[PDB]
Nucleic acid binder design. Sequence first.
RNA 1: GUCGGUCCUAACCCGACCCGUAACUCGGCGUCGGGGAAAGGGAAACGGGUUUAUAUUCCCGUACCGCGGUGGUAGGUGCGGC
RNA 2: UAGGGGGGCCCGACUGUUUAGUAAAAACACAGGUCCCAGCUAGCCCGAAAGGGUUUGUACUGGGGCCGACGCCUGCCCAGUG
Lengths: 89, 84, 96, 81, 237
Amino acid sequence: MKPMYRSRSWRRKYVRTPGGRTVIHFERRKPKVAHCAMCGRPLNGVPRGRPSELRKLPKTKKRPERPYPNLCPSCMRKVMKAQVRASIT
Amino acid sequence: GRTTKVGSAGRFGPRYGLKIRRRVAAVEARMKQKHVCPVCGRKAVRRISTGIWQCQKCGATFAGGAYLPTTPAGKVAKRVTASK
Amino acid sequence: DFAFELRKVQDTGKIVMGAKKSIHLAKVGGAKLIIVARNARPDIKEDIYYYAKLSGIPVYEFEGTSVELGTLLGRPHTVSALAVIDPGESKILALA
Amino acid sequence: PAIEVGRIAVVIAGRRAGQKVVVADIIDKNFVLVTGAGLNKVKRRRMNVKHLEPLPERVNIQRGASDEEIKAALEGAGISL
Amino acid sequence: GKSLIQQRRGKGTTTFRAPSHRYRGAVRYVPLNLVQERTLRGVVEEILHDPGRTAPVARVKFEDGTKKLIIAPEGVLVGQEIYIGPEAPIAIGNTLPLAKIPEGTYVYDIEGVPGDGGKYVRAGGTYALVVSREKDKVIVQLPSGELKAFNPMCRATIGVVAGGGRLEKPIVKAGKAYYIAKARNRFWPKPRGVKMNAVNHPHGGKEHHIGRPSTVSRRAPPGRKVGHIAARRTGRR
RNA sequence: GUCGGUCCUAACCCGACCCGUAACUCGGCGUCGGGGAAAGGGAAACGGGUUUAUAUUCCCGUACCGCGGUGGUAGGUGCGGC
RNA sequence: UAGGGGGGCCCGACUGUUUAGUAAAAACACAGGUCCCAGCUAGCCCGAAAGGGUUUGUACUGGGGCCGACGCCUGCCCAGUG
Ligand SMILES: [Zn+2]
Ligand SMILES: [Zn+2]
């Protein structure tokens, strides 16, 4: 093992080969899930991945269609209601 | 629990002396009881960090004392500026 | 609120306690009076005041707390909002 | 006042969030019938009353009407969607 | 001879310098040349621990968008609105000029000269009390007991600093003191001068005693001010 | 092309302007700019064979990334669900 | 593979550190006690100056000395030196 792989940011895994070798493969770690701006609660409908993984997805497979996809639904409804009630006069 | 005299300072065992063990135990016992919230009235307030207190139920987060949510001078200032 | 008037409602008429039910009755209709506690969530308070000022239902603001309402009633829990549907033998609507 | 038939409201959930809508009928305690009425891209669909915010505006119609019959009312009443 | 610790500190080496890259930024109010007569409004959006401060700090967002740090008062809530200016009410957390603050009020974070950003009464649990107002000076009682006059246009904030009672509990262990000192790169552990050699300290020598009065004149040269510097008295009472 | 270096910043360092010094290849300095990690952050390749001695680098098989084109379509001007 | 045990006395409260290569200790440090300077263009300090450290700090703070966990206590003297 090289020093770059003695580093615990590489998540080693053991894998048996079609030739009977049983080698070690190295991969980088996955980033965590998107969180709400107001409450810090987790979001739904948003996939996890590194940039190369996210660039192999279309636009509509990355976020929910509804407005304000960066907020949890309760906070979204708060925002829409406040807009409405300020659009009265 | 199953100690006559020592409390949280039973982690010390024999060491560091009476005065210091007693004081640590008392401060920590008064700190680790659930306190009344100033927004909802329920007993669900705990210390996050030195000077920072949070309620588990309503989620209310406020600044206070080191080992208690209120201080005497704080209560006096509240009373006086409520007068004026 | 008055201990005796609200307890008389409790035993003579019919009440529906809880903020979700109160908001729903203020939105659709089917209530006579709505009582809200001072320190209740501003979200709930705003929704109630809006829907009831539209529907035409009177709202009384109880100066005490949600815990105190709950205990006033025979209940071990918060009662932040309350809806009087059926009054009886009491003068509770006379206080708004 | 109520969720009266003829009431104008905004949707606050889903795709069609930020859009006015006129109420047409009432199904259950929780569900009502809302039409976009072809002013805007919303069809004749049952919706929950948690998902609508009612506006003070109103319209003269009957309990259960049609889409060509509502568009009229908004002709003169003075209501754009 | 050889040098003292107090002389090596002046050189400015890593052994003595504060690790302020670890801290949250400095704490200052808002400049007058941008709060002249406007009475700005802000909302509290976070309360934070600061490693170089002894007091908790709060993050305030203002209307334009500008975010800033303030020293937090005992009682302030996340989601609370504060006001900075001359026509701001008298309420815990608001910043006003001394000329608009009644007598008897508890005050913190006082400026020395108007516009300097805040200098006085900053530590956990401290408070100052307003004593007298006049047209040329406002007299305030500082936590040392001392009465001091300020210009009436100097700004202060109303309430008490948060984080009091800190010293109610013993440190107990040497390791806890290790960490507390490392947090601000204080010289720890501390040596005694009477158990140093004579080349190292004006005390010092194999018989471990001060052999001359420990009171030292205010006019003594550097390398010689150790013990009790210009003491008016010594002892118990 | 796919492994590492060539990018980013950390603690820190340097230059110009500016100030000091009888002066300097000396001492400082906020700012402007530039540097600073082959175990921190950071696009993309795996298995089998081949040589006396190289191989995730040559060969066989089967893949991926970036840039640039060609030709069609979704969309612009579309929908299902409270 | 795998503890010999018990009773008295002196020092140091304890975990920790020390004379690389004749001293590991009863010496150092430690929590804690108490005294001194200082309201900030401060107090203490580096430097030939310019500038700078404590300072992204403000008396529940920063600097300077002596004793050294805990318990019971800490008497008299300001003529002399300071
Ligand atoms: Zn949210
Ligand atoms: Zn609460």
